[PDB]
C-alpha cells in the first residue's frame, strides 16, 4: 500500500467536513460546526491492486477559520475543490480556492464537487458549471446525504495517482 | 383499422397456464402459446418422473446458510423456491380419490428459512419481507447451534398476524421434497400443534403460524367446505395430487380455482361465498382519547 | 515538548520553531497542537520574520515565516514609516534576485519563489504607481540582461496581470482597481515588446514557455490593437501551435483570441482560422481515430484533445455565421465540422459535453432559420425543389452524423439511486436535477430539433439501428437501451400520423426480436425497452384503447415476474400510463360495457399480492390518478371508497383493537402496518386531491389520536433513556407513522380548496393532538416537521387561519425558541423549520403580529436577528427575506408604523451592519444591501417623526448620517474620518442603484481589512466623490 496527501477546500457549509465523515463512518452530520484550520482525516480504499491510503486535509472555508492556508497545501499530491450548488456564491469563488491551490501545486490531479444535489430547489444549474473545462479538471455532482456519486472523486484520483485507467474498488479485507 | 402490435405474446416464462394472468378461458378459449387445456398427459409423467435425481439435502443446507458456491435444476437464491399452481383446468377423472383442496387465505406468499438462531420471510421473488424470532426449530435465539433449520412455506395474512402454514420442504433439518403431498400435509397436521407456543403471540414469538387444513374433493366434502366459516377471508382454493413431491416452480400436479369459479367447472351447491368479483361537522371516533 | 512561543522580549531560537513546522507537515495527533500553536504564532507582529528566513523542514519554514510578512504588507503597510516599507521592498527584491539564479531553484521549490514574488505583487499593488515609477522600465532592462530573471519576471508579471484584472473585485477597491487597471494599461508596450523578443530569438524553452504562459493571462484584458494589429496570431500558429511542448499553451491562447466579438477584425479571425486548421491537419491527420489516441494518450496528448474541442466549439460557436457567407472557407469549415465529429466519439464525458455543447448550438440556430422539412418531394420539371434553406444546405450531410450521434450515444434518460432515508427504510429515489440528466435533456433537445428539420433521416437511422439489433447483430444491452432510450426521447417531434407508422413498427420488430431471443435475461431487458417506449408515446395509447388496454393487462402480469427489476419496470410504466391516460380508464371504451376502473378495483389483491410493499405504494398513487378523473361526485366517491377498502380494514382492525387496549399501539408489528397504511394514504391523497376529503375525513380524528399515543412514547422514552433510543426499530418505526400522518394533513390541505373548510374542520383538532403534543414533548423528542406542517398549511389558509396564530404561536414559538438560542449549531432542521414558520405567518398572516402584545412582538422580531446572524446559509437567508418582507408589510399600515421606526429602525439598522461587516455573511451581500437601500431611501422622506427628540431641525437624515457614521467610527475605529464620510455619503447616493450599492458595501469590507491610517491617502476621493451624485442625479432625471 501507498498514501496521498489530499487537500480538500472550498467555501464554509460547502459540505467537506460533512463529506469526508460519511467516508469514514457512513453517518451523516445534520449540524453546521465549522473546521478551524485544518484536520487531517486517513481514509483507506481497497483496490484490485492493493490498498490506498488519502489522507484528506479538511481545511476551512470561513476566512475567520483559515489559519495557515496555503501552508496546508504544501507538497499536496490531489485536490477536490467543493461547492454547494444551492449557494450560487460558493461557485463563484471556486476561482480562488483552485488560484490558491495551484501557485502551491503546479499540477497534481484535482477534482472540483458540487455537492448537495439531492435537494430539490437548486440554484447553480449544470448548464453553468464549466470552470473545470479550461483548466483540465475533473466535475461530479455529489450529495453526502444520499451518497450520490458519493466515491466518483476518489476512484478518480487513485486512476491518475497510480497510473491505472481500469483501477477499480473493491473492499476487500 | 388499426393494424395493431400482438403485444399480448410478450412473454418471459413457458409456464403453462399462469395464474400470472386470467384463466384460459377468459380471453382465448383456444388460447395462447404458453397455454393449454390438457394438464392430464404431464401431471402422468411428471410424478413418473421422480426418482431422486436431486441432492435436496444439499440444497436445504444452502437457503438454510445462505451459501451458493456451488463446488431441471434448483434455483440458487431465495427467488423460485415455492411450488406454484396453474389454474385448474383438466379436472381429473380421479379427483376425488387422490386429489386433496387446501383452502387459502388473502394474504402474501412466503418462502420462511429459520435457521442459525432466526426466521425469514421471502416473496417469490426472494425479496426480503420480514426478520424476526419464532419457535420453527432454528428460528429463534434459544435452539440447537447446529442443522436445526426449517423451511415452510406460507401465506402471510396482515389481519390476524398468522403465517398459515401451507407446506413444509424442510424440518429440523430433515428435507421432505421427496416426500409425497399426503406425507407432507399429516406430518404438518401432527407437529405444528406440537411446538410450544408457535400458534401464539409473545416476545420470542411474534408471529403465530397455523397449519391449513385440507379436505377431500368429494362432491359431498367440497359443497360442504364452500358452506364452511374460516378464520379469515377466503382467496382461493389449491387443489393437490396426494402423490406429488415438492417441486419449485409451476406444475400441473397443483391447480388453483376461486370459489365462484368451482361450482361451475364441476357441479356443486353455489349458495354461501361463490360470487364472481349551524354548521357541520360529521366524523366520530373510534379510540375516544383526548380531543 | 509544549512548543509555546508568546515570548518576544526573550532570544527566540530558529531550531525550535523549525521543528514544530515538521510536525505540522509529518506526524500525527501531535500536530493538531503544531498546526494550533502556528497559528498562534500571528498576534503581536514579524520581528521574527528577518532572522527566519536569515537563518534557515527549511524552505517550509521560509514559507511560514513569509506569510507573516505577506499579512504585514496587505494591512499596515500604510501606516508603517516610509525607511521601513523601503527596507522591506529591497529585502524582497534583493531576495528575489538571489534564489532565481542559484543552479539549484528547480529543487528549492517553484513554491518559494511563487511565494516571494506573490509577496512583491503584494507590494506592488500598495505603491507600484506613485512610489515604485520606474518598475516596468527596470524589469524589462533585468529581462533583457538575463535569461534566469526574465523567466522568473515573466512570472511577476503574470501574477500582477491576475491580481489587477482577475481577482481585484473584493480584494482591492473599486477606484484603487481601476487606477491599476490604468497604470497596467499606460505602460504595456515595452511589456508587450519583450513577449514578442523572446518569442523571436530566445531559445530557451523553459523561458519561452513562461512567456506563452504569461501571455495567456494577458489575453484577458490587453487592448485588441496587440492582438489583431501585430504578428502574435501569425507567430503562435506558425511556430509554437505544432511543436510538442508548447502545442497545450499555444492552443489555449487561440482559443482565447477567438472568443472576442469581431466586428472589427473580420480578417484576422479568418486567416486565424484557416492558418490553425493547416497546421491541425498536419498535427492530427484527418483519418486518424481521436478516441484512441485518446484511450491511449497521456496527459499532454489527452488535454490537446479536449483543447482542441475547446477550440472548435468556441470558434465554429461564435465565428460560424463567418466560415459561411465567404465562400473560400468552405473547406476549412468542413474539416473543422470533421473533427468535431471524430472528438465527438471520444470516451471522455466532459469533452463529449463540450463537443455537444455546439451541436445543439447548431441545430437550434438552422431550426430558427426554419422549423419545418424540406417539402419532401421533387418539382413537377425534375428541377431542384428549392425549399432548402440556404445555410442548412451547408451542414445536410454532417446533421445527418449527428442525428446518427445523438441515437448512438444516447444518455440514460432517469438516474435512480437506491438509498434508505433516515429509519433504516431502504428505498429508490429519483433524481431530478443532475448533471448526467442534464446530458439526456441536452441530447434530446439536439435530436428533437435534427428532427424538426428532417424526421424521415431520423425515422431511418433508428429503423438501420434497430434492424442491426434484430438480424444484424450488434445485438448487446447497451446498445439495444441506448436505442429505445433515443427512440422515446423524440416523442411528439412527429406528426400524430408518422408516430403511427413509427411506433407500430418499432415494437412489432422489438416482439419479434423477444421471441427469437432465448433467455429470461435477454427477454427481460427487451419486454422492458418495449415498456419503456411504450410509455413515452401517451398520444398512441390515448388513440387506440385496446392497445392500451393490452399494454395494462400486460403489465399486471408482468407483476408477479420475478426476475431481478421486472417489477420496478412494470410499477413505473404503470404509473406513467394511468397519470397520462386517465380519463380512458375512468369511462367507458368501445368495446365493452363498464370502465376499466371497475376490473382494477375488482381485483387489486390478486394483481398486486407478489409486490414488495413499496411497489404497493406505487400502484396505489396510479390508480389514483384514474379516480381523480372521474368528476362525478357520486361515482368518484363511491370509487373512493372500494379504492381505499384494503387499507382500511388492516386499519379499522388495529383501531377497534387499541380502543381495548392503547398498548396494541406499541406492538412492533401493528406500528409497522401503520406506517405502511399511511404512505398508501398519502400517495393516494396526493393523486387524488381534494376529493379524498371523503377518505381523509373518515380516518382524521382517530388518525391524530395514535399520532399523540406514538409522540407520547417516544418522548417518554427518550426521557427515561435519552436520545440514544431513537436510534432502534420500534421507535422509528414510530417516527415514521408521525411524519407520515403530517404528510398526509399538510398534503391534502395543500391540494385543498375550501379555505374556511379546511380552518374550521380540519384545523382545530390539528392543536390538541399536534401542536400541544409537540410543547408537552422533551426537547430531543419533538418532530421538526411539526413546525414545517405548520408552515404549509398557513402558507395555504393564510388569512383564514389568522385568527389561530397565537394560540399556534403558544405551543410551538417561544418552546422551540429556547432550543435554538444558545449557539447557531444544534437543532439544524428546527432553526430552518422554525424560520419557514416564521416567514409564512409574516408573509399571510401580518395582522396577526399586531394583535399580539408589543412584547411578544419585540420577541419575534429578535428572533428575525438571530436567523441573518447564522452561519447556515439557508437560515440567514430566510431570515433577510422575513426582515426585508416585513419592514414593507409594515409598510402599508399607516397609523402603526410610525411607532415602528421609533422604536426599531435605529436598531435594525445597527444589527444589519454588524452582519455586513463580518467575513462569514458575504452570501447575504445582494439581500444586506437590497434592505438598507430600502431603509435609507425611506429615511429621505417617509419616517414622519422626530427620532433625535430635539425638534425638527435635526431632520432624521442628518440625524442617520450622524449615527451611522459613530456607529461605524465607534465599531472601526482605525478608519480615518473620510474614509467613513465617502460611506455614509455612498448609503443615501446609491439608494437606488441596488448593484452599485453592493460595490459600495464591498469597498467598505475591503478598507476596514487595512490600516490605511490617517496618514497616506490612496483613497480618490474628489474623483469618487462625484460618481456618487452622478447616481444621485440619476434618480431624479428618468
Ligand atoms: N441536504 C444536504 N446537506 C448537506 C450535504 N452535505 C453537507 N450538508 C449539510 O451542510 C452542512 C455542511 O457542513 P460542513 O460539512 O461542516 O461543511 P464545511 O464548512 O465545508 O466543512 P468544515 O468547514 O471543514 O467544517 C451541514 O449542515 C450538512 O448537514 C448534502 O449532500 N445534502
Ligand atoms: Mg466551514
Ligand atoms: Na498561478
Redesign the pocket.
Same mark, same amino acid.
Given at each position: 500500500q501507498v498514501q496521498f496527501k489530499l487537500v480538500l477546500v472550498? +467555501? ?8 469526508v465523515k460519511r467516508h469514514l463512518t457512513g453517518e ?6 465549522? @473546521?478551524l484550520g485544518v484536520?487531517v482525516h486517513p481514509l483507506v480504499f481497497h483496490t484490485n491492486r492493493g490498498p490506498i491510503k488519502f489522507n484528506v486535509w +479538511? @481545511?476551512?472555508?470561513?476566512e475567520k477559520?483559515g489559519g495557515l492556508r496555503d501552508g496546508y497545501y504544501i507538497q499536496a499530491q490531489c485536490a477536490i475543490i467543493?461547492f +454547494?450548488v444551492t449557494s450560487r456564491v460558493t461557485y463563484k469563488n471556486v476561482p480562488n480556492w483552485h488560484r490558491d491551490l495551484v501557485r502551491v501545486c503546479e499540477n497534481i490531479p484535482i477534482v472540483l464537487c458540487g455537492?448537495?444535489?439531492? /435537494?430539490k430547489d437548486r440554484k447553480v444549474k449544470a448548464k453553468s458549471i464549466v470552470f473545470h473545462r479550461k483548466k483540465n479538471l475533473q466535475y461530479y455532482d /455529489?450529495?453526502?446525504?444520499?451518497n450520490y456519486n458519493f466515491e466518483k472523486p476518489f476512484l478518480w484520483l487513485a486512476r491518475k495517482l497510480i497510473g491505472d485507467p481500469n483501477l477499480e474498488f473493491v473492499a476487500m479485507p | 383499422p388499426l393494424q395493431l402490435p400482438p403485444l399480448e405474446r410478450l412473454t418471459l416464462s413457458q409456464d403453462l397456464n399462469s395464474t400470472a394472468a386470467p384463466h384460459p378461458r377468459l380471453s382465448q378459449y383456444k388460447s395462447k402459446y404458453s397455454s393449454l387445456e390438457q394438464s392430464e398427459r404431464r401431471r402422468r409423467l411428471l410424478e413418473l418422473q421422480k426418482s431422486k435425481r436431486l441432492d435436496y439435502v444439499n440444497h436445504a443446507r444452502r437457503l438454510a446458510e445462505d451459501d451458493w458456491t456451488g463446488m431441471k435444476k434448483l434455483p440458487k437464491h431465495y427467488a423460485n423456491q415455492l411450488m406454484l399452481s396453474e389454474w385448474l383446468i383438466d379436472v381429473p377423472s380421479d379427483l376425488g380419490q387422490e386429489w386433496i383442496v387446501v383452502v387459502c387465505p388473502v394474504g402474501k406468499r412466503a418462502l420462511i428459512v429459520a435457521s442459525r438462531g432466526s426466521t425469514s420471510a421471502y416473496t417469490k421473488s426472494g425479496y426480503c419481507v420480514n426478520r424476526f424470532s419464532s419457535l420453527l426449530p432454528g428460528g429463534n435465539r434459544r435452539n440447537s447451534t447446529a442443522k436445526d433449520y426449517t423451511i415452510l412455506d406460507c401465506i402471510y395474512n396482515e389481519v390476524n398476524q398468522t403465517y398459515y402454514v401451507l407446506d413444509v420442504m424442510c424440518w429440523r433439518g430433515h428435507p421432505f421434497y421427496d416426500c409425497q403431498t399426503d406425507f407432507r400435509f399429516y406430518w404438518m397436521h401432527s407437529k405444528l400443534p406440537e411446538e410450544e407456543g408457535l400458534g401464539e403471540k409473545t416476545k420470542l414469538n411474534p408471529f403465530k403460524f397455523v397449519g391449513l387444513k385440507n379436505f377431500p374433493c368429494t362432491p359431498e366434502s367440497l359443497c360442504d367446505v364452500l358452506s364452511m366459516d374460516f378464520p379469515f377471508e377466503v382467496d382461493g382454493l389449491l387443489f393437490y395430487h396426494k402423490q406429488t413431491h415438492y417441486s419449485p416452480g409451476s406444475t400441473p400436479l397443483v391447480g388453483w380455482l376461486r370459489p365462484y369459479m368451482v361450482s361451475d367447472v364441476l357441479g356443486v351447491a353455489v349458495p354461501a361465498g361463490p360470487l364472481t368479483t349551524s354548521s357541520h361537522s360529521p366524523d366520530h371516533p373510534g379510540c375516544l382519547m383526548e380531543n | 515538548h509544549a512548543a509555546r512561543q508568546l515570548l518576544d522580549f526573550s532570544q527566540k531560537l530558529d531550531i525550535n520553531l523549525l521543528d514544530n513546522v515538521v510536525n505540522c507537515l509529518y506526524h500525527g495527533e501531535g500536530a493538531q497542537q503544531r498546526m494550533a500553536q502556528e497559528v498562534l504564532t500571528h498576534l503581536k507582529e514579524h520581528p521574527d520574520a528577518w532572522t527566519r528566513v536569515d537563518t534557515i523542514q527549511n524552505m517550509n519554514t521560509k514559507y511560514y515565516g513569509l506569510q507573516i510578512l505577506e499579512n504585514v504588507i496587505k494591512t499596515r503597510w500604510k501606516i508603517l514609516p516610509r525607511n521601513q516599507c523601503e527596507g522591506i521592498k529591497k529585502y524582497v527584491v534583493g531576495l528575489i534576485i538571489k534564489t532565481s539564479s542559484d543552479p539549484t531553484c528547480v529543487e528549492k521549490e517553484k513554491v518559494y519563489i511563487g511565494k516571494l514574488n506573490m509577496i512583491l505583487v503584494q507590494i506592488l499593488k500598495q505603491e507600484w504607481p506613485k512610489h515604485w515609477p520606474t518598475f516596468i522600465s527596470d524589469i524589462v532592462g533585468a529581462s533583457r540582461t538575463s535569461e534566469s530573471l526574465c523567466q522568473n519576471n515573466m512570472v511577476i508579471l503574470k501574477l500582477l496581470s491576475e491580481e489587477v484584472f482577475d481577482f481585484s473585485s473584493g480584494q482591492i477597491t473599486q477606484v484603487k482597481a481601476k487606477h491599476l487597471k490604468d497604470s497596467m494599461c499606460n505602460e504595456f508596450s515595452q511589456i508587450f515588446q519583450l513577449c514578442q523578443f523572446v518569442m523571436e530569438n530566445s531559445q530557451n524553452a523553459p523561458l519561452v514557455h513562461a512567456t506563452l504562459e504569461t501571455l495567456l493571462r494577458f489575453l484577458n484584458w490587453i487592448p485588441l490593437g496587440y492582438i489583431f494589429e501585430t504578428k502574435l496570431i501569425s507567430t503562435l500558429i506558425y511556430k509554437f501551435l505544432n511543436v510538442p511542448m508548447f502545442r497545450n499553451v499555444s492552443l489555449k491562447c487561440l482559443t482565447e483570441i477567438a472568443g472576442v466579438s469581431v466586428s472589427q477584425y473580420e480578417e484576422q479571425f479568418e486567416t486565424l482560422f484557416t492558418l490553425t486548421m493547416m497546421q491541425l491537419k498536419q498535427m492530427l491527420p484527418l483519418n486518424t481515430n481521436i478516441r484512441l489516441a485518446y484511450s491511449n494518450g497521456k496527459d499532454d496528448e489527452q488535454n490537446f484533445i479536449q483543447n482542441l474541442s475547446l477550440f472548435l466549439c468556441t470558434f465554429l460557436k461564435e465565428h460560424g455565421q463567418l466560415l459561411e457567407k465567404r465562400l473560400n472557407l468552405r473547406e476549412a469549415l468542413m474539416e473543422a465540422l470533421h473533427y468535431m465529429l471524430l472528438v465527438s466519439e471520444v470516451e471522455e464525458t466532459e469533452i463529449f459535453k463540450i463537443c455537444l455543447e455546439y451541436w445543439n448550438h447548431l441545430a437550434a440556430e438552422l431550426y430558427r432559420e426554419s422549423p419545418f422539412s424540406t417539402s419532401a418531394s421533387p418539382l413537377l420539371s425534375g428541377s431542384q425543389h428549392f425549399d432548402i434553406p440556404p445555410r442548412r444546405q451547408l451542414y445536410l450531410t454532417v446533421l445527418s452524423k449527428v442525428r446518427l450521434l445523438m441515437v448512438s450515444r444516447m444518455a440514460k434518460p432517469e438516474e435512480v439511486l437506491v438509498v434508505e432515508n433516515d429509519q433504516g427504510e431502504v428505498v429508490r429515489e429519483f433524481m431530478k436535477d443532475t448533471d448526467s440528466i442534464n446530458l439526456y435533456k441536452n441530447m434530446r433537445e439536439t435530436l428533437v430539433y435534427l428532427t424538426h428539420l428532417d424526421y424521415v433521416d431520423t425515422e431511418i437511422i433508428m429503423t438501420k439501428k434497430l434492424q442491426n439489433q434484430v438480424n444484424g447483430t450488434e445485438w448487446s444491452w447497451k446498445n439495444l437501451n441506448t436505442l429505445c432510450w433515443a427512440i422515446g426521447s423524440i416523442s411528439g417531434a412527429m406528426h400524430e400520423e408518422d408516430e403511427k407508422r413509427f411506433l407500430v413498427t418499432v415494437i412489432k420488430d422489438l416482439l419479434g426480436l423477444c421471441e427469437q431471443k432465448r433467455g429470461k435475461d435477454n427477454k427481460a431487458i427487451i419486454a422492458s425497452n418495449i415498456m419503456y417506449i411504450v410509455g413515452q408515446y401517451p398520444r398512441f395509447l390515448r388513440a387506440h384503447w385496446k392497445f392500451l388496454k393490452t399494454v395494462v393487462n400486460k403489465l399486471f402480469e408482468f407483476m408477479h415476474e420475478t426476475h431481478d427489476g421486472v417489477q420496478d419496470m412494470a410499477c413505473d410504466t404503470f404509473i406513467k400510463i394511468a397519470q397520462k391516460c386517465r380519463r380512458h380508464f375512468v369511462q367507458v371504451q368501445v368495446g365493452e360495457v363498464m370502465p376499466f376502473i371497475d376490473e382494477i378495483l375488482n381485483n387489486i389483491n390478486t394483481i398486486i399480492c407478489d409486490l414488495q410493499p413499496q411497489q404497493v405504494h406505487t400502484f396505489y398513487e396510479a390508480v389514483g390518478y384514474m379516480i381523480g378523473a372521474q368528476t362525478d361526485q357520486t361515482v368518484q366517491e363511491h370509487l373512493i371508497e372500494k379504492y381505499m377498502l384494503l387499507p382500511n380494514q388492516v386499519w379499522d382492525s388495529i383501531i377497534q383493537q387499541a380502543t381495548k387496549n392503547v398498548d396494541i399501539l406499541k406492538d412492533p408489528e401493528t406500528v409497522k402496518q401503520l406506517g405502511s397504511i399511511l404512505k398508501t394514504n398519502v400517495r393516494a391523497c396526493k393523486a387524488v386531491g381534494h376529493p379524498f376529503v371523503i377518505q381523509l375525513g373518515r380516518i382524521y380524528l382517530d388518525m391524530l389520536n395514535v399520532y399523540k399515543c406514538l409522540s407520547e412514547n417516544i418522548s417518554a422514552a427518550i426521557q427515561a433513556n435519552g436520545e440514544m433510543v431513537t436510534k432502534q426499530p420500534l421507535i422509528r418505526s414510530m417516527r415514521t407513522v408521525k411524519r407520515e400522518t403530517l404528510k398526509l394533513i399538510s398534503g391534502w390541505v395543500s391540494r385543498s380548496n375550501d379555505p374556511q373548510m379546511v380552518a374550521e374542520n380540519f384545523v382545530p383538532p390539528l392543536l390538541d393532538a399536534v401542536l400541544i403534543d409537540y410543547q408537552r414533548n422533551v426537547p430531543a423528542a419533538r418532530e421538526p416537521e411539526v413546525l414545517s406542517t405548520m408552515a404549509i398549511i398557513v402558507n395555504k389558509l393564510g388569512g383564514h387561519i389568522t385568527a389561530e396564530i397565537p394560540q399556534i404561536f403558544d405551543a410551538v414559538f417561544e418552546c422551540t425558541l429556547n432550543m435554538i438560542n444558545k449557539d447557531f449549531e444544534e437543532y439544524?432542521e428546527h432553526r430552518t423549520n422554525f424560520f419557514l414558520l416564521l416567514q409564512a405567518v409574516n408573509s399571510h398572516c401580518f395582522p396577526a403580529f399586531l394583535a399580539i402584545p408589543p412584547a411578544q412582538f419585540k420577541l419575534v422580531l429578535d428572533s428575525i436577528i438571530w436567523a441573518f446572524k447564522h452561519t447556515?446559509r439557508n437560515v440567514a437567508d430566510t431570515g433577510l427575506q422575513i426582515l426585508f418582507t416585513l419592514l414593507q408589510n409594515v409598510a402599508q399600515e399607516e397609523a402603526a408604523a410610525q411607532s415602528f421606526y421609533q422604536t426599531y429602525f435605529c436598531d435594525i439598522l445597527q444589527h444589519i451592519f454588524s452582519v455586513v461587516t463580518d467575513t462569514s455573511h458575504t452570501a447575504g451581500l445582494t439581500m444586506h444591501a437590497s434592505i438598507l437601500a430600502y431603509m435609507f431611501n425611506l429615511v429621505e422622506e417617509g419616517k414622519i417623526s422626530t427620532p433625535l427628540n430635539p425638534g425638527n431641525p435635526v431632520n432624521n437624515q442628518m440625524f442617520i448620517q450622524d449615527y451611522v457614521a459613530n456607529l461605524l467610527k465607534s465599531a472601526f475605529p482605525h478608519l480615518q474620518d473620510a474614509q467613513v464620510k465617502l460611506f455614509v455619503t455612498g448609503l443615501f447616493s446609491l439608494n437606488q442603484d441596488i448593484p452599485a450599492f453592493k460595490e459600495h458595501l464591498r469597498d467598505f469590507l475591503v478598507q476596514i481589512k487595512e490600516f490605511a491610517g490617517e496618514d497616506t491617502s490612496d483613497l480618490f476621493l474628489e474623483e469618487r466623490e462625484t460618481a456618487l451624485r452622478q447616481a444621485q442625479e440619476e434618480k431624479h432625471k428618468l
Open positions: 472550498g +467555501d464554509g457549509g460547502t459540505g467537506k467536513t460533512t463529506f451523516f452530520e445534520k449540524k453546521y460546526v465549522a @473546521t484536520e +479538511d @481545511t476551512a472555508g470561513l477559520f467543493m +454547494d455537492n448537495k444535489v439531492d /435537494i /455529489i450529495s453526502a446525504k444520499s | - | 439544524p447556515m
